[PDB]
Every structure is written in structure tokens, then in C-alpha cells.
Structure 1
Amino acid sequence: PRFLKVKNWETEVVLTDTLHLKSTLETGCTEYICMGSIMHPATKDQLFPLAKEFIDQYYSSIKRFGSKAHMERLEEVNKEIDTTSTYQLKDTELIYGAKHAWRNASRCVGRIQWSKLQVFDARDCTTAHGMFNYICNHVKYATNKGNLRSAITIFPQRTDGKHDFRVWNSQLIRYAGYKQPDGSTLGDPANVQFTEICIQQGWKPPRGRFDVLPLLLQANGNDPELFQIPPELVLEVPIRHPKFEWFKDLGLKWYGLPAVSNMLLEIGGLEFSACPFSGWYMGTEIGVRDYCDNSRYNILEEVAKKMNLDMRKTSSLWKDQALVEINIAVLYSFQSDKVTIVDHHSATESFIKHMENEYRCRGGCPADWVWIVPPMSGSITPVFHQEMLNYRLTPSFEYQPDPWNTHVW
């Protein structure tokens, strides 16, 4: 139980962390073994302290800790957990809970935006058709003709675990991936399995390189149902390069809206298994990971060829040159089409400013260096030289099992 200091080795700025003392969940590390690079490390009785903990910090946050209203809410919650084995969040608590889950997301470089989140309460939803409707509205609001706005739509919380709401898509908008007879893959290889599942369910594939997948929506534990997002809601950006006029000939494009739909939102012990949320892209997510991962679109080789680079030895850094150029193209393309995007230099600078804000007003900011540092040009961004402390605060976004591994039809 100590105040812990973090140092930036470039600016020499030292911050003092006290916030970590309030954390209650585990990191996955031990005194003897650090696991910082591992990607994936109820009952009434369990429920009430978790609920009380959350109500406590909520009333503490609006400067009414120990108020009439505070105690009454506590009374109300325990008595509701008692009778029904669960409880329902106030609209105000729901919005607070969702913003703080984003605020506490140690892996997210975009958290300077945390309090600017549009929260859609979908807790009255009963069917997959209703889910589809709420999701269309979410996509339309968030896309906003290219001026993207951060949003989250929250479907009903888990009850018995046999009636979960799940969006089976990993994101609301993604491209299909196809196994070919010659053993190669068409489209996005990361979605090959999901695409097969959709096909089995009756989806008719265009079998192109960038086919927008249908929504697969599961309501109240029932079999998931297929829906086609209205295409006019799906903003895409054809990728071209400001100097290489041949770049457009690659036929590359991407969607404007990154909308993660497979995570679990946890607030006060309650579990929201369906909580698709969205902001906007950092260029490297598309330009580095999506396009250049060997297990993804894997385009480095093709680009470097058109750049006429020497590809015989690795020490020519041909991979590195082509990587920067692809990322220039992505940024240039989005900007030219007036679609919100942020480069990794701008994003990491804001994060450092955000950290400083959080230490000042909250006494800390949980941060996962492994995820915060961008997948290219690491050390020429300020976060590389920033020491971070990682710890788990609630409310939070958590991983959950892929739905096809748990569901019985």
C-alpha cells in the first residue's frame, strides 16, 4: 500500500499514483511472474457488495456520498436483490457506469474522449428484430455522415445465463472471409469462421474481397437471426495514395465506423453481454494491423512490388518502407473524404495529456503499455517513454466466450 511513481524518461515528468489502491479485480500477474503480454489472462450474496460498491462510487462522484438519496438507493437495491436475485440500474447510473467502463479501459489510447459518450438504453429490447433496430439507429447516429460520434447501445443484462443477448459479430461492420479451393483465403481471414456460420444460416455470399457481413443477433437466449444492415448506413472509404497514383489500382477500401460488439460490460455486478460500442479509428489499426498482419489482408508484398523495392534481403527494410506508405494512404484517404480518423502521433500525444489530467483529478490512470504503444514507430511516439501502471477498476469492459462455443440451438 504505497503511492507509486511513474516516470516519463523523455520529459522527466514524474506522476504519483494513488488510484491503484482502490482496485479490487486481479491483473493476472503475481509477485514472481509478470503476465503483461498475455492477451486473455452470480448469486444474491455475491451481488450486493458489488452493487453497494458501485452505488457508493456513483454517489461519491456526484458529491452526495451518504445522502438521504444515497441510503435510500442502497435500501432499494438490497431489497430488490433480495426479492428478485438481481436489480435494475437507474438511467443516470447506467450512463455513469458506461462512461466509467471506457474511462477504466487500460488498453484504450482514446480515453481523453471518455466523458463524451452517447449512451443508448436498449434494456427494453425483447427480440432480434428489436436489436437490429437499435443497432441501425446506433450506426446512423455514430456515423453522422463522416463526423463520427462515440456511442454505445446497451441491451438487457444477463439473468440466468440461458437468456443472454449477444451480437455474434465481433464488430457491427466487418468484411467476410472465404476459404478457397486452392487453400488460399479471399477477404478477411480473421472472419472466416464467422462467415461460414452466416452462410450456414442462409446468408448468400457475394464472395468478394470486401463484403460487409450481415448482423447475427441473439435475443433472450434464442437462436440468432440474420439481418442486412441498410447499405446507405455503411460509410466506406476507398484507399488511395497522395503521391503514388497506382495505389488506387490495389482496389483497397475500409469502413469508417469501428464498432466493437463482442465485449461484456460489467457495472455494479450486473453483466451486459450485448453492448456494442464505437468511436473512430486510429490509422494504424487499419494500415498496420488489418492490412499488414500476415494473418490478415497481408498486402506488404504486393505494395513493395509496385514500389519496385529490393525484396531479396530483410535488411533493405522493404517491409518497413511499404508499411509507412500504406499508412500515409489510409490517413490521406479518410481525411480527403471527411471521415474522422486520428494518426498515432496525435493520438498518443492526447493520451499523455489525458494521463496528466487523470493523475491530477483522479490520482491515477490505469494503462497497458503493451496495447497503448502503437504497432509501428513505437519510440518516436511519447507513450513509448512513458512508464504506466496497469490495474483493474470497475465498471469495466471484459472479454467473454465466442457465442458459437456456448450456444445450444
Structure 2
Amino acid sequence: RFLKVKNWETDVVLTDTLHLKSTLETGCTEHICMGSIMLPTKDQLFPLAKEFLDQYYSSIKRFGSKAHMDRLEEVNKEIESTSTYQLKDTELIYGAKHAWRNASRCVGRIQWSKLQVFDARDCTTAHGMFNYICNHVKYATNKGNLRSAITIFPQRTDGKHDFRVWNSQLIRYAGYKQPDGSTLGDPANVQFTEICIQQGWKAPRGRFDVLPLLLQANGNDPELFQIPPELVLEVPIRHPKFDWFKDLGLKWYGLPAVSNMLLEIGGLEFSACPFSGWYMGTEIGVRDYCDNSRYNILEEVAKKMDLDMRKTSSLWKDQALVEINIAVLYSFQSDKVTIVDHHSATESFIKHMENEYRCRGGCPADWVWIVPPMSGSITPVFHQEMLNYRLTPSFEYQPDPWNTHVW
């Protein structure tokens, strides 16, 4: 019931109580651990609402007070009558900040309380969604000085009227499958890029074509908009020592902004809720550039470094991987665009864990996602035991709209 986590490099031991207030299910049983799997009515709604409003009034040192009871009463009357309810602004802000606080896969949660929340619940059309999103992008980007933000569109109703951003991130490069069999641009986005062109996007057919936004309002068929080019901050990738690096022609965008997730607050579901912070360097330099199914650039870089590529044991992949990452960080830093390296980010997360064990009694963390994809064991998180569990308010992953939607 009270569980220990031990750090194997420091011997520091933390006691978790927070897990007892664990809402959802992990995917694991007593018989089988699924820790590495990517995807492991009016009745239900009121306990859900009450549970949230209880943590809310608790957080503002007002538990069991008249204002608390009053609100619980009000929301109950609204549900019985309308079959749903509306969050107060303060509740909405608190809930978004907490969905981030509870994101067990996020290493950057030291920043959780600095989240600017944009209430787009009055939005009604795709063009409105677009105006809201351009504003989110410009705000968050801040000429390179990135600020965290989320924009929250209208909540689910009968489920026939959802708002969705069809893009998985607000900003991403196009992918096209080519005559000669290989892939131009980002292979991750081949499918999406095609749905855009079939919806009428005129693709430049390049390698770093910023995709158009595909926006669904009120369960309507989605529409295409180009983000204003001057809003998309991009970074040319060079190396502080390899003059030839620039010649690969690599760029990446400054703003990471996940736009396919579902925000659940007090039982209510915000299906379109694009959010953003800033990059950890390894995301671009390890995953985006080096994943085999991504830009897959290790071979080309290794070659330019003239390494021994004939045997795996010369560790040429490993050498090239590091230089690529040095270059990502160098470039962002030189262009004064916010970026964190895996060392400083994981250091921050350990500090954040300790604060959360101290102040909150725990911190849900998913070790498989928290430990960076290169240099694991030289980051502190590697040696930190973590417990993973599902708390609410939360972000949840949801089916691609094109699977669900009918035209």
C-alpha cells in the first residue's frame, strides 16, 4: 500500500502514497507486465465531476467549505438537467496544468505549473480553430523564447460533434512515397500527406514541406489551412566543427506541439487540445533524424565522417549519433531558440520527482519513456526506480480521426 522507490546511484529512497488515488488501469496484471507496450451517460459523469471538484477545492485550501458544496450542488443540477456541465475558467486552468502534472511519460514536468491556457471553448468553426491555433503558435514561439501553452477547444457532447485537429502535431514535415521506391521527406507522415492532397493540398513535393492543418469543428468534415510561413520558426542544422554538416541540408522546427491528444477533466473530454513546450535535443537528433523509419541519416553522416562502416563493433553508428545531436543543440542555441539537452532535462526531472514525493506523496513516471533514447545510464533517470500509474485529469492518446469519421 505504501511503496518504495530507490535510486541505485544515490541510495535515496522515496515513499509513494499518491498511487492509492490511482484512477485508471495500467495494462499490467499480477501475471504480465505490459510496461513496454505503446498502447497497453449521466451516472458515470457525476462521480467523475465530484472527484475532480474535490481535488480542486482541496488544492485551494477550501475543502468542505460552503463554496465547495455550492459548486458540487450546481454541477449536479447541471448534469441532471443538461447531461453535461461546464468548467469554470479557474477549474479549466487547474485541470490542464494537472493533466500535464500527471503525464507519466513527460520528462519536462518541472515546468507543469507554468502553462498559459487558452480557452477556445467559444470556438464554432474550422476557420475559428485556425485563428486560435495561429495565435497559440505565435504566443508559444515568442521569437525563439519558447513558452508552454495549450489551447482548449469545445468538449465532447454526444460524440457526434467533436472538434479534432487531424494533424498529430501542429507543425510537421510532409512525406511522399516515390517512383523509385524510397521516401521523400518524413516517412511518418506519408499517410497524412496523402489525405491532405486528396482533400486538395498542393504539395511542393519537397523534403521539409510544413504540412497544412486539417481542422474539424463540430463534427464537421475537416478543412485545410496553411499556417502562415512567418509563424513557423525553423532552424538550419549545422555542426560547430564539421563544416560539411550544413551540406546535408537539414532543418527542424522550433515548436513541438502535440495536437492529437485528449484532455479529460472531471469526466469531460476535450478532443482537440493542441499543446506545446520546447524540445529536448534527443527527440530531433536521435529519433527524428536517426530512426530507420524516419529521416534515417546515420549512414550519410557516418560516411562524411569517414568512419569504418564495415563492422558494427567500430561503433560508427554510435559516433555519428552523438555528433548529430551535438549539431542539433548547437544550432538551436546559436539561433537562440529554446532547447534542452537530455542531461539537464533528466537532472530537472529528478529534482521534480523529489519535490513531488515531498509535496504530493509521489509522481507517476514511465521509465521506458523518461530515459532518453541515447546515453541512458549516464543520465540520473536511468538509475531511478519509478512507479507508473494513471491519475486524472489526464492526456490520453486517441484513434486517428480518419478511422472514426464518416464523410
**Fold shared by both chains (TM-score > 0.5):** yes
1:294 and 2:276 aligned: no
Report the Cα distance in structure 2 between the residues aligned to 1:225 and 1:389, rounded to whole angstroms: 42
Write the deviation string for residues 195-242 of structure 1: whole angstroms up to 9, x where unpaired: 000000110000110000000000000000000101111100000000
Report the Cα distance in structure 2 between the residues aligned to 1:347 and 1:233, rounded to whole angstroms: 27
Report the Cα distance in structure 2 between the residues aligned to 1:195 and 1:63, rounded to whole angstroms: 49
| Residue 253 (structure 1) shift | 0.3
| Residue 307 (structure 1) shift | 0.3
Write the deviation string for residues 164-216 of structure 1: whole angstroms up to 9, x where unpaired: 00000000000000000111100000000000000001100001100000000
Task: Classify the secondary structure of the residue corresponding to 2:123.
Answer: coil
Report the Cα distance in structure 1 between the residues aligned to 2:373 and 2:355, rounded to whole angstroms: 25
Report the Cα distance in structure 1 between the residues aligned to 2:42 and 2:24, rounded to whole angstroms: 19
1:365 and 2:363 aligned: yes
Report the Cα distance in structure 2 between the residues aligned to 1:316 and 1:150, rounded to whole angstroms: 41
Report the Cα distance in structure 1 between the residues aligned to 2:44 and 2:371, rounded to whole angstroms: 36
Report the Cα distance in structure 2 between the residues aligned to 1:115 and 1:281, rounded to whole angstroms: 18
Task: Classify the secondary structure of the residue corresponding to 2:264.
Answer: strand
1:21 and 2:23 aligned: no
Task: Classify the secondary structure of the residue corresponding to 1:387.
Answer: coil
TM-score normalised to structure 2 length: 1.00
Report the Cα distance in structure 2 between the residues aligned to 1:24 and 1:141, rounded to whole angstroms: 33
Write the deviation string for residues 82-128 of structure 1: whole angstroms up to 9, x where unpaired: 11100000000000000000000000000000000000000000000
| Residue 39 (structure 1) shift | 0.6
Alignment match, 2:174: 176
| Residue 56 (structure 1) shift | 0.4
Report the Cα distance in structure 1 between the residues aligned to 2:21 and 2:45, rounded to whole angstroms: 19
| Residue 248 (structure 1) shift | 0.1
Write the deviation string for residues 252-309 of structure 1: whole angstroms up to 9, x where unpaired: 0000000000000000000000000000000000000000000000000000000001
| Residue 350 (structure 1) shift | 0.3
Task: Classify the secondary structure of the residue corresponding to 1:246.
Answer: helix
Report the Cα distance in structure 2 between the residues aligned to 1:89 and 1:235, rounded to whole angstroms: 34
Report the Cα distance in structure 2 between the residues aligned to 1:86 and 1:370, rounded to whole angstroms: 37
Report the Cα distance in structure 2 between the residues aligned to 1:298 and 1:256, rounded to whole angstroms: 20
Task: Classify the secondary structure of the residue corresponding to 1:241.
Answer: coil
Write out the 4+ residue segments of structure 1 that deviate beyond 2 Å after TM superposition. Answer: none
Report the Cα distance in structure 2 between the residues aligned to 1:31 and 1:229, rounded to whole angstroms: 48
Task: Classify the secondary structure of the residue corresponding to 2:252.
Answer: strand
Task: Classify the secondary structure of the residue corresponding to 1:71.
Answer: helix
Task: Classify the secondary structure of the residue corresponding to 1:211.
Answer: coil
Write the deviation string for residues 12-37 of structure 1: whole angstroms up to 9, x where unpaired: 10011011111121111101111100
Report the Cα distance in structure 2 between the residues aligned to 1:215 and 1:39, rounded to whole angstroms: 25
Report the Cα distance in structure 1 between the residues aligned to 2:23 and 2:106, rounded to whole angstroms: 20
| Residue 162 (structure 1) shift | 0.7
| Residue 3 (structure 1) shift | 1.0
Q: How many residues align?
A: 407
Report the Cα distance in structure 2 between the residues aligned to 1:223 and 1:387, rounded to whole angstroms: 46
Task: Classify the secondary structure of the residue corresponding to 1:21.
Answer: helix
Write the deviation string for residues 363-394 of structure 1: whole angstroms up to 9, x where unpaired: 00000000000000000000000000111100
Out of 272, 275, 283, the residue aligned to residue 273 of structure 2 is 275
Report the Cα distance in structure 2 between the residues aligned to 1:198 and 1:215, rounded to whole angstroms: 9
| Residue 38 (structure 1) shift | 0.5
Report the Cα distance in structure 2 between the residues aligned to 1:47 and 1:347, rounded to whole angstroms: 37
Could you say what the CA RMSD is over the residues aligned between the two structures, in angstroms? 0.4
Report the Cα distance in structure 1 between the residues aligned to 2:74 and 2:181, rounded to whole angstroms: 60
Report the Cα distance in structure 1 between the residues aligned to 2:180 and 2:53, rounded to whole angstroms: 57
Report the Cα distance in structure 2 between the residues aligned to 1:374 and 1:262, rounded to whole angstroms: 22
Equivalent residues in 2 for 1:378-397, closer than 5 Å: 378-397=376-395
Report the Cα distance in structure 1 between the residues aligned to 2:130 and 2:64, rounded to whole angstroms: 41
Alignment match, 2:64: 66
In structure 1, runs of 5+ residues without a counterpart are none
Report the Cα distance in structure 2 between the residues aligned to 1:401 and 1:384, rounded to whole angstroms: 31
Report the Cα distance in structure 1 between the residues aligned to 2:158 and 2:231, rounded to whole angstroms: 35
In structure 2, runs of 5+ residues without a counterpart are none
Equivalent residues in 2 for 1:230-249, closer than 5 Å: 230-249=228-247
Task: Classify the secondary structure of the residue corresponding to 1:223.
Answer: coil
Report the Cα distance in structure 2 between the residues aligned to 1:24 and 1:376, rounded to whole angstroms: 32
Alignment match, 1:147: 145
Task: Classify the secondary structure of the residue corresponding to 2:243.
Answer: coil
Report the Cα distance in structure 1 between the residues aligned to 2:295 and 2:213, rounded to whole angstroms: 22
Report the Cα distance in structure 1 between the residues aligned to 2:228 and 2:52, rounded to whole angstroms: 38
| Residue 332 (structure 1) shift | 0.1
| Residue 333 (structure 1) shift | 0.1
Report the Cα distance in structure 1 between the residues aligned to 2:210 and 2:31, rounded to whole angstroms: 46
Report the Cα distance in structure 1 between the residues aligned to 2:58 and 2:290, rounded to whole angstroms: 46
| Residue 330 (structure 1) shift | 0.1
Report the Cα distance in structure 2 between the residues aligned to 1:296 and 1:47, rounded to whole angstroms: 41
Report the Cα distance in structure 2 between the residues aligned to 1:198 and 1:65, rounded to whole angstroms: 49
Task: Classify the secondary structure of the residue corresponding to 1:120.
Answer: strand
Task: Classify the secondary structure of the residue corresponding to 1:266.
Answer: strand
Task: Classify the secondary structure of the residue corresponding to 1:141.
Answer: helix
Report the Cα distance in structure 1 between the residues aligned to 2:165 and 2:250, rounded to whole angstroms: 27
Report the Cα distance in structure 1 between the residues aligned to 2:103 and 2:306, rounded to whole angstroms: 42
Task: Classify the secondary structure of the residue corresponding to 2:70.
Answer: helix
Alignment match, 2:126: 128
1:93 and 2:69 aligned: no
Report the Cα distance in structure 1 between the residues aligned to 2:182 and 2:114, rounded to whole angstroms: 43
Q: Which of 250-259 and 24-33 deviates more?
A: 24-33
